Each structure stands twice: as structure tokens, then as C-alpha cells.
Write a protein that binds this ligand. Structure first.
Ligand SMILES: [Cl-]
Ligand SMILES: [Mg+2]
Ligand SMILES: [Mg+2]
Ligand SMILES: [Mg+2]
Length: 424
């Protein structure tokens, strides 16, 4: 495989016909210093194509989806040039003949402040499996300065999602602990205080949230019981709103844990009780938007509601849920198609459920006027998908992002509220 030098790569940075491809893990790409490098993240402009994906049959369709064409001049890099060999060969097998490997990313590029790098601004909220393993093992890990933690396996009324296999030592939290199946909003501060204490969570406890994807099926009575990792990010939103200072989400959920080869447990871990949450609830109320404020945001040039639903929901063909009656949409919201239905986030995730390359998210969002200068309230049917979209914006450091908790459920439960239907 041909090589490209450091000086050559610097000179070409910003050329629209050169495709730089980072084959490290998505978490390293995001900013995690997985090998102790002084500077984490990716070379400016690089795309993410983790070499782990070579074992997946989707690899070639992913490359094409990311608009990497055989006529492109491709530059690969990893922590070492040896880490790039298989990817380069796979490219050549598929008609990509202009492929170079950059050998000096680490430590030459990472170690030199003058060479531009990018990263997810708040990457340390989105943790890799290796970090969780180190935390549970009591090993030294970066981006951690606490002495109190809990790993929480989220699910919606489905303890078997946890009992069928979970991260060792983790306890389960039903999403019903923190949100009401009546309002489908976050519970009241007094309810939240008691629920968090009964799961052993204080405001100064580092909470690591994850869920298990079990293929939600719209035919089923409770498809959300299979969308465990959406549920985990939904609980992350509620905990951050409530006042847990250090909340992490395991990138890709349970899948990332087993893909790393770490041990699986089926023990029903007893919950510990803490006497006091230790902070006022909510400590970050600005993360949550309710319907009066959502109506105000529809009237402002400074702000927008962002509808994170599927297309059949958006045009009022279906409600999307077997527990929401009305089908339609909120007038004036910006459509941000989630994926296929109410329980999937394909447009925001990779095939392995890790978050989609954040540059692609910000690019698609920008085309619809979803941009960080606005106060944005993401929403969906009841707030699950909206919480995951919100979390992605939070990770990018966007300063004014919220979840309109009530969503379409609350909006349409009031017959006075106007709505739209059909293709716009
Ligand atoms: Cl999920
Ligand atoms: Mg072969
Ligand atoms: Mg809600
Ligand atoms: Mg549900």
C-alpha cells in the first residue's frame, strides 16, 4: 500500500477531492485518548470508518452511503499503519485503487498542536466499553475524577432485558421509575427524588446508562420494551435535568459491551438505597420545555421545535404508537426524520447502534435550519427519540438545546391545539 507523508497531508487539508478516513473506534474518533495520546480526536475533515466494521457484511454499503467513490483519493490512518492494512486491502478488492495510508498520525500528528484536529466537544459523556470495564474494575481511567459510580441497565417494563444478560454489577432501572405512563413526561421532583434514592443515585454519583436493543416490533404490545438504548438516553436526559452532575451513556449500548468481549452476567443485583439525593430537583430545568414554552418557541425567530419522528407519523398517516390515538403534526416544527418508526433511530445511529458520525448529523441538521444559534426543543411522540436527538446536540456542545417533553402526545391530548396532516 502506498504511503502519504505528513507534509503532503497538511497541504491537502480542505481539498474536496481527498477523503481522509479514520479507521479507529468511533470513540477514539470522537476524542477519547484511547492510547494515551496527548491530543484526542480525528484529523480535521476526516470521516469515521472503524476497522471493526470489516467483519460486518454491511461494510461496502456503509462506504457507499458515506459517499466514498472509487474515483476518490483515499487516505487511511489509524493509531498505527498496521491497523489500516485490512481496510486498504478491502478497498482495493472493491475497485478503489487510489488508496494511501498515513503512517504518522500517532504520535506525530496527535503530539503536535500545529496540526489541526477535531473532536466531539463533550465526547466524555459518551463512553466506550473499555472505559466502563476500567471503571467497574477499579482501574485508572481518563475523564473520571469521582469515587462513586453506578452502572444502570435501562428498559421499559422488561426486566428480562436485564436478566437475560447485563454488564457485571449493573442494576436495572425501569424507565417507569423516572417517567409517568400517564403523562409520558418526567415525573415530579418529589417522585424523582425518591426514585433516584431507591436506585442508589445521588447528585454526585457518576451514573453510566445503557440499554439493550432487542428489535422493536410494531406488532407487539410494548415495542419500547425492546428499544432499551433509546430508553437509556431518555433516562440520561431526565437524570441530567434532575441534577445528576456526571451522567454517561455507553456508546452503542449493550452491543458495544459484548462486542468488546467482556463478561456477561445474569445475576439479579440488589439495589442499594441512598438516604438523600443531595441536590434540588430540578437543577437543570432549562433542559426541559413544556407546552406553554413550546408554543412561545414556535413564535420566535430565535428558536424552533424539532420533530424527531418517522415520515408516516409526520404526514399523519399513523400515530406511530398503539397508545397514542391522534395522527398529525405540530404546525411550524422542523422535521428531523428519526428513521423507520417510533422505536428506531437509524438516521442517528450506525448499524452497531453507536451514534452516527457527528459531522453527518450537523450537516443534515443544517440543511433544515437546525443550528446551534437557535434555542431548540427536540420532541417526538412522548420524548424518547427526542431525548436521543437532544443528547447528540448536547454532545456537540450546542448551548441552547432542550427536550419538549410533552411531544405529540401532550399536544394532541388537548383538542384546542391546532395540527396539520398530509404531505406538506
Ligand atoms: Cl435501542
Ligand atoms: Mg475474501
Ligand atoms: Mg413526554
Ligand atoms: Mg414505549
Amino acid at each position: 500500500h502506498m504511503e502519504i507523508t505528513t507534509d503532503s497531508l497538511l497541504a491537502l487539508l480542505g481539498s474536496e477531492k481527498v477523503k481522509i478516513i479514520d479507521v479507529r473506534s468511533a470513540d477514539a474518533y470522537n476524542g477519547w485518548r484511547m492510547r494515551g495520546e496527548v491530543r484526542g480526536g480525528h484529523i480535521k475533515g476526516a470521516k469515521s470508518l472503524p476497522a471493526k466494521w470489516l467483519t460486518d457484511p454491511e461494510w461496502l454499503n456503509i462506504v457507499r452511503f458515506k459517499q466514498i467513490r472509487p474515483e476518490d483519493a483515499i487516505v487511511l490512518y489509524g493509531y498505527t499503519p498496521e491497523e489500516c492494512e485490512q481496510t486498504a486491502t478491502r478497498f482495493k478488492e472493491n475497485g478503489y485503487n487510489n488508496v494511501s495510508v498515513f503512517h504518522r498520525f500517532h504520535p506525530d500528528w496527535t503530539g503536535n498542536d500545529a496540526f489541526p484536529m477535531d473532536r466531539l466537544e463533550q465526547y466524555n459523556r459518551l463512553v466506550p466499553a473499555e472505559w466502563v470495564n476500567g471503571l467497574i474494575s477499579g482501574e485508572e481511567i481518563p475523564e473520571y475524577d469521582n469515587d462513586t459510580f453506578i452502572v444502570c441497565h435501562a428498559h421499559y417494563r422488561n426486566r428480562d432485558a436485564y436478566l437475560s444478560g447485563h454488564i457485571p454489577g449493573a442494576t436495572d432501572m425501569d424507565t417507569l421509575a423516572l417517567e409517568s405512563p400517564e403523562t409520558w413526561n418526567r415525573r415530579t421532583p418529589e417522585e424523582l427524588k425518591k426514585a433516584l434514592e431507591e436506585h442508589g443515585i445521588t447528585a454526585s454519583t457518576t451514573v453510566v446508562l445503557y440499554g439493550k436493543f432487542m428489535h422493536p416490533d410494531n406488532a407487539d404490545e410494548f415495542p419500547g420494551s425492546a428499544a432499551g438504548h433509546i430508553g437509556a438516553i431518555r433516562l440520561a436526559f431526565i437524570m441530567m435535568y434532575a441534577g445528576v452532575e456526571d451522567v454517561r451513556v455507553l456508546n452503542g449500548g449493550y452491543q458495544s459491551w459484548t462486542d468488546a468481549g467482556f463478561a456477561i452476567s445474569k445475576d439479579d443485583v440488589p439495589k442499594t438505597t441512598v438516604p438523600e439525593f443531595g441536590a434540588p430537583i430540578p437543577s437543570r430545568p432549562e433542559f426541559a420545555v413544556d407546552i406553554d414554552e413550546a408554543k412561545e418557541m414556535l413564535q420566535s425567530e430565535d428558536s424552533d421545535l424539532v420533530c424527531v419522528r418517522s415520515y408516516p407519523e409526520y404526514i399523519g398517516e399513523v400515530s406511530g404508537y398503539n397508545y397514542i390515538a391522534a395522527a398529525g403534526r405540530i404546525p411550524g416544527a422542523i422535521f428531523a426524520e428519526c428513521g423507520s418508526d417510533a422505536y428506531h433511530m437509524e438516521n442517528y445511529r450506525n448499524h452497531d447502534h453507536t451514534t452516527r458520525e457527528y459531522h453527518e448529523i450537523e450537516d443534515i441538521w443544517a440543511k433544515s435550519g437546525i443550528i446551534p444559534k437557535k434555542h431548540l426543543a427536540f420532541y417526538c411522540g412522548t420524548g424518547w427519540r427526542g431525548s436521543e436527538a437532544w443528547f447528540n446536540a448536547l454532545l456537540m456542545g450546542w448551548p441552547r438545546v432542550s427536550v419538549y417533553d410533552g411531544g405529540w402526545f401532550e399536544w394532541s391530548n388537548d383538542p384546542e391545539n391546532p395540527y396539520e396532516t398530509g404531505v406538506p
